[PDB]
Each structure stands twice: as C-alpha cells, then as structure tokens.
Amino acid sequence: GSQLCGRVFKSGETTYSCRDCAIDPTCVLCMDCFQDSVHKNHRYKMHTSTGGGFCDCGDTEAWKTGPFCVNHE
C-alpha cells in the first residue's frame, strides 16, 4: 500500500494530530504510532475520525518535524 503504517480508520475512531508539528489538523496519526513518537510530549489534539481515513505516519510532506514513529523509523 501507499502508507508506511497503513492502518485505516473506522467511523468514530480516535486519532491524534500534533499542533506543533502537523502541517494542518487533517495530518493525523493512529494511536499506536502516536504513543510511539516524539509528539506524545508536544501540544497534541485528539480527533474522532468520521470513517474512511488513514494514518499519516512517515508522510514526510505532512510533518515539519518527527514524521516517523519509532516502529516505522
């Protein structure tokens, strides 16, 4: 698939963005990537997915800083 992580979200699924590093609030991380990245110590915001979205881990165009969790790099 296109995504390093490539978990895809159900409706109602909790996801995270980072207000410090995300290009915009639609740049989003799955809970497992989030909890394994530098952003867990930043100004993060939780978003409830409306369904159909996907994790942006390792999207190097989506993060000013810290684009990969430890698991995906």
39: contact with Zn ion by CB under 5 A: yes
Q: Which residues in 1-30 contact Zn ion (CB under 5 A)?
A: 5, 18, 20-21, 30
DSSP letter (8 states) at residue 38: G
In the chain, after which residues does the backbone break, taking C–N over 2.5 angstroms as a break?
none
With beta carbons less than 8 A apart as the criterion, state whether 63 and 69 touch: no
Contact pattern from residue 40 through residue 69 relative to Zn ion, giving x for each residue in contact according to CB under 5 A and a dash for the rest: --x------------x-x-----------x
Number of residues forming the site for Zn ion (CB under 5 A): 12
Indicate the residue among 40 and 50 with the shorter CB distance to Zn ion. Answer: 40
For residue 25, what are its two tokens?
Answer: 């609030």
